[PDB]
RNA sequence: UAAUUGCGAUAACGAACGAGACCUUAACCUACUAAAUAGUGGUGCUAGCAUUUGCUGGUUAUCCACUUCUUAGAGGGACUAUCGGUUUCAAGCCGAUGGAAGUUUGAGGCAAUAACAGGUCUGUGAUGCCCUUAGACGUUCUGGGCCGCACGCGCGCUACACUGACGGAGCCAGCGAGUCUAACCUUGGCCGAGAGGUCUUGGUAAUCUUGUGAAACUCCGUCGUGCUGGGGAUAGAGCAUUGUA
């Protein structure tokens, strides 16, 4: 069901990786960043990731994570 | 000026157009009027919504469709969108916003999911069986 | 006495459409050059060619199907202009399929 | 009211098939890749593309003007509308169809299966693509029936966007014993297409950050 | 003072056409009518042994004036009654040719339609006349 | 969780195929803006409930405008997006929501390595082997049978009105179908209760057939308690069409 695949966290973590301060949690705001960003070919996972960039972007503002 | 606004869509079996030109409040869809339709058979979906809004709501709006289309009960869940289109609209741009969205707002619960895009169909056949789902029975031995 | 009307209806054989943007664009230009009044292309539904078959060479064993479809479309343009402007996209950049059919269409 | 026309549209591509498999039943020994039509004002643009351009130009007339000729008797154009030449190959080891009869030669002129089988391989991985594999079906000895196999590089398959970059090169042999059947796929590099979606799917990349910039405060100097 | 923009009921106009048809007699009816079985997919002929084509007639007339063209196709597909087609799927299969036909002469000797371009025939302005003054007032007196 | 989908201490590390990602279709924008094929308005207006120029037939270069009636030719489509519960509190999962949607937004296509003595020498003009090749198992013309039936087996239509018909009201919307080596669609006129002879826009299809003109369903009267508008197996006469037959 509503559960992500390898890619998607590959690729949340190394955009975090390189754009933590920025990319606030509205998902709009995400998705235009990750779209003036990044060139994800497959047009869906350009909107699947941003969910998955603020989710761990709301933990790690909630407090620190493994890894 | 403005020669044609956009709008569209397809009910279970009519369309829409964009033909809702400028009028002076009468209202007739061609094929089942307001004043001199007579169906006297199945008319709880025009008794529901227009309670307290007024009766005649003939000011400016004219729904004007030269085409037309629909089956046997498209054509009620047809009408019943289209009073629903021109009661929201007869408030909307001819009387106060305020009386629009009061109106709306008192109609909250009455519009059964009109407000959502067009994507109730049926679904296409599947091979290898009868109907839609269902499948053809087996011949075992 | 040149610069008449015709209003003349020209034919094209392809199957996309920059071709015909590109084709606008070039008529929409050279009209301009001389205050020509434009006219609009022409617009079709779709299509689909169904052809249901089987998938096995013997019918024995499952019962599989198999169907696919195509879109080609040849177009016909409703243009207002003179012979010499008409006979001038054929001539003038040559590209596939940016050309002219000579045909008469008019009544 | 004047209404036909998928009378011809499909005309249209029976034309070419039908052109396409007589060129491969004919053209065996220039080691054939295929053609490609645009219609156009009384000349069909027709290209055919060779590697061997040379053997099926002749002399400048011992083979292309009869081979206009054929076409044209074919359906009785006007002698004059088809224009019939052919066109030199780009990625000459890459055309699934011409490695395919390539190795077919290389099984006929009476050569060991495998070392040319991974040798043509190794040469296309050399030419540079991104994979490629080799089946062959049929038997190699006085046995019941095998299929031997073997690939490099890497591999895909399937979905919708494997059609565009992936090639299909399925051929047959006649030999002594009896018929049997090579089968290969090589796919291409996706960067180097210029044609078409270039990424996957799968892939994805991401380009880097700006620059870094210290305090600064905002202005003392003397100006 | 004649007809409105659109003034239409169903069954009561039909048994009031029918009822005023009936005292004129004027229809003149072939003869071989209550023979007939209506259809070539009829389940039995007619019960009533008296009516039925002045019914059709009534019918016909009251879409003559709400439609512009009419068709003698069109009105025996209309009905194209369902074949009891013994141990089969029923189908529908169209109706009698011979009772339109006559029918239709007959709405014509009494001069309601009239052949006209853009297919066939149309509403006559003996039509124009009824809606304007006579029968417009007079089914507006009736009902 | 749909899963080798993820979390995870981990003699494992780093990669591939499958999964997935992907394509098709049901999807809205008051648009980039489109088509005398749906056709649109003020139709200048003309014959049609009046001191209600808007339409009914339409003015075949009727206006400045053309998509507003199909469409993608495109592009943005809109994702766990917020609260509760819920587990190293991280994977993930149920309710409340405003709303195109909330098993993956529905369904279809696309398919891993290794195999089966699985089907197909009757799609081959693709073949190894043997057989036949002049009294032919090659090919061609006339006629029968592959529909024959003492007996079993496996799909599928009709049936046990009472929830079943006759005259009528919806014929309106839906994926299709139709030729310069000429036979496909049928419009209104005539006698036609199955065909037939008319002249029509018809052979480079939103234009003509079909304005994609079905039955299912209900009431005004007649139809009843069975073997009556439940029955139609099995047979006998007649009117006809297609095709050399």
């Known amino acids: 069901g509503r559960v992500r695949t390898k890619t998607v966290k590959r690729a949340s973590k190394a955009l975090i990786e390189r754009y933590y301060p920025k990319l606030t949690l509205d998902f709009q705001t995400n998705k235009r960043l990750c779209d003036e960003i990044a060139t994800i070919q497959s047009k869906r996972l350009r909107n699947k990731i941003a969910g998955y960039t603020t989710h761990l972007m709301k933990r790690i503002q909630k407090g620190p994570v493994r890894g | 000026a403005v020669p044609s606004v956009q709008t569209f869509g397809k009910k279970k079996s009519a369309t829409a157009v964009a033909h809702v030109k400028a009028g002076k409040g009468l209202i007739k869809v061609n094929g089942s009027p307001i004043t001199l339709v007579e169906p006297e058979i199945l008319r709880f979906k025009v008794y529901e919504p227009l309670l307290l809004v007024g009766l005649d709501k003939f000011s400016n709006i004219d729904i004007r469709v030269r085409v037309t289309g629909g089956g046997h009960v498209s054509q009620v869940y047809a009408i019943r969108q289209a009073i629903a289109k021109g009661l929201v609209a007869y408030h909307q741009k001819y009387v106060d916003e305020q009386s629009k969205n009061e109106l709306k707002k008192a109609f909250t619960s009455y519009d059964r999911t009109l407000l959502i895009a067009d994507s109730r169909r049926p679904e296409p056949k599947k091979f290898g069986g009868k109907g839609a789902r269902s499948r053809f029975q087996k011949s075992y031995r | 006495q040149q610069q008449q009307i015709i209003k003349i209806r020209i034919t094209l054989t392809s199957t996309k459409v920059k071709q015909l943007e590109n084709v606008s664009s070039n008529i929409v230009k050279n009209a301009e050059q001389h205050n020509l009044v434009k006219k609009g292309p022409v617009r079709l539904p779709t299509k689909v060619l169904k052809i249901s078959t089987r998938k096995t060479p013997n019918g024995e064993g499952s019962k599989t199907w198999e169907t696919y479809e195509m879109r080609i479309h040849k177009r016909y343009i409703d243009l207002e202009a003179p012979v010499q402007i008409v006979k001038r996209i054929t001539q003038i950049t040559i590209e596939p399929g940016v050309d002219v059919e000579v045909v008469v269409a008019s009544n | ?223 | 003072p004649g007809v409105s923009v659109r003034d239409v009921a169903a069954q009561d106009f039909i048994n009031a056409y029918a009822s005023f048809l009936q005292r004129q007699g004027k229809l003149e009816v072939p003869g071989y009518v209550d023979i007939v079985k209506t259809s070539s997919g009829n389940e039995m002929p007619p019960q009533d042994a008296e009516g039925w084509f002045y019914k059709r007639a009534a019918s016909v007339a009251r879409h003559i004036y709400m439609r512009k063209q009419v068709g003698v196709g069109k009105l025996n597909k209309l009905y194209g009654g369902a074949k009891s087609r013994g141990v089969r799927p029923y189908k529908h299969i169209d109706a009698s040719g011979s009772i339109n036909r006559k029918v239709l002469q007959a709405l014509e000797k009494i001069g309601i339609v009239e052949i006209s371009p853009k297919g066939g025939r149309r509403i006559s302005e003996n039509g124009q006349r009824d809606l304007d003054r006579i029968a417009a007032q007079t089914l507006e007196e009736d009902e």
Do not use: W
């Open chain 4, 1 to 223: 009211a004047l209404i036909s026309k998928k009378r011809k549209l499909v005309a249209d591509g029976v034309f070419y098939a039908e052109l396409n498999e007589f060129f491969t039943r004919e053209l065996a020994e220039e080691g054939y890749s295929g053609v490609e039509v645009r219609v156009t004002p009384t000349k069909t643009e027709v290209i055919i593309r060779a590697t061997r351009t040379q053997d099926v130009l002749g002399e400048n007339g011992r083979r292309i003007n009869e081979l206009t000729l054929l076409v044209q008797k074919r359906f009785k154009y006007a002698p004059g509308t088809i224009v019939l030449y052919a066109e030199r190959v780009q990625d000459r080891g890459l055309s699934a169809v011409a490695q395919a009869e390539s190795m077919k030669f290389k099984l006929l002129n009476g050569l060991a299966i495998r070392r040319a089988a991974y040798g043509v391989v190794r040469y296309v991985m050399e030419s540079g693509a991104k994979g490629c594999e080799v089946v062959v079906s049929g038997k190699l000895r006085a046995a019941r029936a095998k299929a031997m196999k073997f690939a490099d590089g890497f591999l895909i398959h399937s979905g919708q966007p494997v059609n565009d970059f992936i090639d299909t090169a399925t051929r047959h042999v006649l030999m002594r014993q009896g018929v049997l059947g090579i089968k290969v796929k090589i796919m291409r590099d996706p960067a180097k297409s210029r044609t078409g979606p270039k990424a996957l799917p799968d892939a994805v990349t991401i380009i880097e950050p700006k620059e870094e910039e210290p305090i600064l405060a905002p202005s003392v100097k003397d100006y």
